[PDB]
Design an enzyme around this catalytic site. Structure first.
Site, PDB file in Angstrom:
ATOM      1  N   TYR A  72       0.815  -1.204   0.000  1.00  0.00           N
ATOM      2  CA  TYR A  72       0.000   0.000   0.000  1.00  0.00           C
ATOM      3  C   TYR A  72       0.857   1.266   0.000  1.00  0.00           C
ATOM      4  O   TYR A  72       1.773   1.406   0.806  1.00  0.00           O
ATOM      5  CB  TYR A  72      -0.942   0.006   1.211  1.00  0.00           C
ATOM      6  CG  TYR A  72      -1.763   1.281   1.344  1.00  0.00           C
ATOM      7  CD1 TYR A  72      -2.946   1.468   0.609  1.00  0.00           C
ATOM      8  CD2 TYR A  72      -1.333   2.319   2.166  1.00  0.00           C
ATOM      9  CE1 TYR A  72      -3.668   2.660   0.691  1.00  0.00           C
ATOM     10  CE2 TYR A  72      -2.046   3.507   2.254  1.00  0.00           C
ATOM     11  CZ  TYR A  72      -3.205   3.674   1.516  1.00  0.00           C
ATOM     12  OH  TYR A  72      -3.865   4.877   1.604  1.00  0.00           O
ATOM     13  N   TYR A 128     -33.541  -0.784   6.777  1.00  0.00           N
ATOM     14  CA  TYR A 128     -32.321  -0.168   6.296  1.00  0.00           C
ATOM     15  C   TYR A 128     -31.965   0.927   7.288  1.00  0.00           C
ATOM     16  O   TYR A 128     -32.709   1.901   7.448  1.00  0.00           O
ATOM     17  CB  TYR A 128     -32.571   0.399   4.883  1.00  0.00           C
ATOM     18  CG  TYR A 128     -31.353   0.779   4.044  1.00  0.00           C
ATOM     19  CD1 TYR A 128     -30.229   1.394   4.617  1.00  0.00           C
ATOM     20  CD2 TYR A 128     -31.348   0.577   2.657  1.00  0.00           C
ATOM     21  CE1 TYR A 128     -29.140   1.802   3.830  1.00  0.00           C
ATOM     22  CE2 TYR A 128     -30.255   0.984   1.859  1.00  0.00           C
ATOM     23  CZ  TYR A 128     -29.164   1.594   2.459  1.00  0.00           C
ATOM     24  OH  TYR A 128     -28.112   2.023   1.705  1.00  0.00           O
ATOM     25  N   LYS A 157     -21.905  -2.851   5.965  1.00  0.00           N
ATOM     26  CA  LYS A 157     -20.794  -2.048   5.493  1.00  0.00           C
ATOM     27  C   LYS A 157     -19.532  -2.666   6.155  1.00  0.00           C
ATOM     28  O   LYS A 157     -19.537  -2.942   7.367  1.00  0.00           O
ATOM     29  CB  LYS A 157     -21.028  -0.640   6.002  1.00  0.00           C
ATOM     30  CG  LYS A 157     -20.090   0.426   5.563  1.00  0.00           C
ATOM     31  CD  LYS A 157     -20.489   1.691   6.318  1.00  0.00           C
ATOM     32  CE  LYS A 157     -19.869   2.933   5.765  1.00  0.00           C
ATOM     33  NZ  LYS A 157     -20.425   3.207   4.418  1.00  0.00           N
TER      34      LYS A 157
HETATM   35  C1  LIG Z   1     -22.850   6.906   4.349  1.00  0.00           C
HETATM   36  S1  LIG Z   1     -24.246   7.687   5.027  1.00  0.00           S
HETATM   37  C2  LIG Z   1     -25.590   6.633   4.393  1.00  0.00           C
HETATM   38  C3  LIG Z   1     -26.019   6.823   2.938  1.00  0.00           C
HETATM   39  C4  LIG Z   1     -27.300   6.048   2.584  1.00  0.00           C
HETATM   40  N1  LIG Z   1     -27.115   4.612   2.787  1.00  0.00           N
HETATM   41  C5  LIG Z   1     -27.741   6.349   1.152  1.00  0.00           C
HETATM   42  O1  LIG Z   1     -28.379   5.446   0.560  1.00  0.00           O
HETATM   43  O2  LIG Z   1     -27.758   7.554   0.783  1.00  0.00           O
HETATM   44  C6  LIG Z   1     -24.180   7.081   6.700  1.00  0.00           C
HETATM   45  C7  LIG Z   1     -25.386   7.455   7.435  1.00  0.00           C
HETATM   46  O3  LIG Z   1     -25.471   6.672   8.617  1.00  0.00           O
HETATM   47  C8  LIG Z   1     -26.265   7.485   9.472  1.00  0.00           C
HETATM   48  N2  LIG Z   1     -26.102   7.071  10.838  1.00  0.00           N
HETATM   49  C9  LIG Z   1     -24.980   7.206  11.683  1.00  0.00           C
HETATM   50  N3  LIG Z   1     -25.136   6.609  12.814  1.00  0.00           N
HETATM   51  C10 LIG Z   1     -26.489   6.177  12.777  1.00  0.00           C
HETATM   52  C11 LIG Z   1     -27.335   5.508  13.703  1.00  0.00           C
HETATM   53  N4  LIG Z   1     -26.949   5.106  14.920  1.00  0.00           N
HETATM   54  N5  LIG Z   1     -28.643   5.322  13.344  1.00  0.00           N
HETATM   55  C12 LIG Z   1     -29.032   5.576  12.104  1.00  0.00           C
HETATM   56  N6  LIG Z   1     -28.315   6.161  11.162  1.00  0.00           N
HETATM   57  C13 LIG Z   1     -27.082   6.509  11.586  1.00  0.00           C
HETATM   58  C14 LIG Z   1     -25.846   8.926   9.237  1.00  0.00           C
HETATM   59  O4  LIG Z   1     -26.800   9.868   9.778  1.00  0.00           O
HETATM   60  C15 LIG Z   1     -25.675   8.964   7.704  1.00  0.00           C
HETATM   61  O5  LIG Z   1     -26.935   9.429   7.102  1.00  0.00           O
END
Ligand SMILES: C[S@@+](CC[C@H](N)C(=O)[O-])C[C@H]1O[C@@H](n2cnc3c(N)ncnc32)[C@H](O)[C@@H]1O
Ligand SMILES: C[S@@+](CC[C@H](N)C(=O)[O-])C[C@H]1O[C@@H](n2cnc3c(N)ncnc32)[C@H](O)[C@@H]1O
Lengths: 291, 291
Positions: B22, B66, B169
């Protein structure tokens, strides 16, 4: 008298093929009939467990980490047995309470006075590295809340220590006092002769292969099943006198003990399995001061 | 030009048969070449995942929970696709942030504004009962500490919700920033076309059978392996033009996308797999406003 003829005893929970409605009044029934019965209960299961690992060639050269080991009087017998057989093992006995002084003065056994926590576990893991670990847990504080906490600590022991095998204390909480479902490690649910009269406790025996860790979910319906199967075993089965059992003691518990002891290795050679077991049993009772 | 002929692309992490040291300077390299590339990345993997469950007959009648769904623009396409095919699914989209308004007004989709925690999970589990749950997690807050927290939340989602299948993820922390070993659920490590140029993220796809939950340990040596295999895939493989790929776009990512899309079901009948994929790809890009 309550006579009966049996082929073999129930060795695992999974073999129990019948159930009975648990009668709460059983709790006020005599729990033990032998002095030091608890040390005996523990000695038989750990000898059974350890003798199995010996068969698979995973005992020699290992470090046995026993958490919840105090007083541990019976552990001296275990240590002597494998030591006399020529197996090389390092024992690490950890408990916040103090151990029986008969365990002192042995270079192969380390007594530790500490109630373990996740941080401590990581510390001794670094310490033990790179020795192979065999975990035995008998920690007790119980309520359903208490039990879940103990079980949560036991899963933590396995994840941090990463043992090659383990023996864990396992009693399913009462369905009527259910709090929430939880997971326990996958393994054989070894039944225990000489457990208290109405105890639903068994010993979870696991051997680990690879980086894998397989768990199993336990729900309230599972809890009802445990309660009924174990109550059937305690109330009906353990109260039997196995008359076709050729042995000075025909009580079911001695019949069950025989099948565990027949798997134990001795230096002395015996003409019959019966001679070896009578000998081991004599030896065990004399050590524990049981008539 | 960087030409090459390939049979098939690498679908899972386990297929990567080579590694490269890397080079940290890769971090300042262009991460994305397409508008809304992240929604595309997510749409392809979830269509691939969900289409598989359809094959096994475990999609129809399920509730898709989701978590980490906002904005979720691409989810509207997913919902439409299965809805138009006649599959019956209830969608439950939970995030503390707000969803794309194109998701409003559908009786089959519930938008929830809540950052979930263990307590909340137990609450919606009671709520959902007795519907079959399919879990998709895209939560993001990262540091190694952040990642471990997310992964710990993901394992909690599975234990409480007890889904029939899940998509999580998954990006292994950097070995040089190792904190401690941890466990992740066992499953296929699906590779993602259109992931950022040097991303080491994949998607963990699991299908649950029985009360069993199998986990796998991840150590620093594992982390070095992830880093090198993924760097080899990003630096070398994804930079190839597959000339024996009969398709308007021969970039490796389109070749990889083709193999995922060929597993998708359509109402319309096509003479060739090539016609179906070109059609689905056209449809997907038009929906996302990608030229
Ligand atoms: C990478 S973004 C997700 C993008 C989404 N999957 C899309 O289709 O657009 C990560 C998300 O996880 C959410 N998140 C973080 N911790 C969370 C939790 N404990 N409960 C729910 N959502 C959470 C954030 O608010 C953010 O919207
Ligand atoms: C049933 S007794 C153990 C008997 C022991 N196995 C024997 O051979 O005599 C349970 C024990 O677990 C110990 N224990 C409770 N929590 C503990 C912890 N976190 N660390 C170590 N021991 C603990 C208690 O101090 C007590 O000695």
């Amino acid at each position: 008298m309550d006579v009966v003829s049996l082929d073999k005893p129930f060795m695992y929970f999974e073999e129990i093929d019948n159930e009975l409605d648990y009668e709460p009044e059983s709790a006020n029934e005599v729990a033990k009939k032998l002095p030091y019965q608890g040390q005996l209960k523990l000695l038989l299961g750990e000898l059974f467990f350890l003798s199995k690992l010996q068969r698979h060639g995973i005992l020699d050269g290992a470090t046995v980490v026993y958490i919840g080991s105090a007083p541990g009087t019976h552990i001296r017998y275990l240590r002597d047995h494998f030591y006399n057989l020529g197996v090389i093992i390092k024992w690490m006995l950890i408990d916040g309470r103090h151990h029986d002084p008969i365990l002192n003065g042995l270079r192969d056994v380390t007594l530790v006075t500490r109630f373990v926590d996740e941080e401590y576990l990581r510390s001794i893991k670094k310490q033990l590295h790179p020795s192979k670990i065999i975990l035995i847990s008998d920690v007790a504080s119980p309520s359903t809340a208490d039990l879940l906490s103990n079980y949560a600590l036991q899963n933590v022991m396995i994840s941090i220590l990463n043992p090659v095998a383990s023996s864990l204390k396992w009693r399913c909480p009462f369905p009527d006092q259910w709090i929430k479902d939880f997971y326990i490690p996958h393994g054989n649910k070894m039944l225990q002769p000489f457990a208290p009269s109405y105890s639903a406790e068994m010993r979870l025996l696991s051997i680990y292969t690879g980086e894998n860790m397989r768990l199993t979910r336990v729900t309230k319906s599972d809890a009802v099943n445990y309660e009924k199967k174990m109550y059937y075993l305690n109330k009906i089965v353990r109260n039997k006198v196995v008359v076709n059992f050729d042995y000075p003691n025909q009580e079911y518990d001695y019949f069950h003990m025989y099948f565990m002891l027949r798997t134990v290795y001795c230096n002395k050679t015996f003409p019959t399995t019966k001679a070896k077991v009578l000998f081991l049993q004599q030896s065990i009772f004399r050590f524990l001061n049981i008539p």
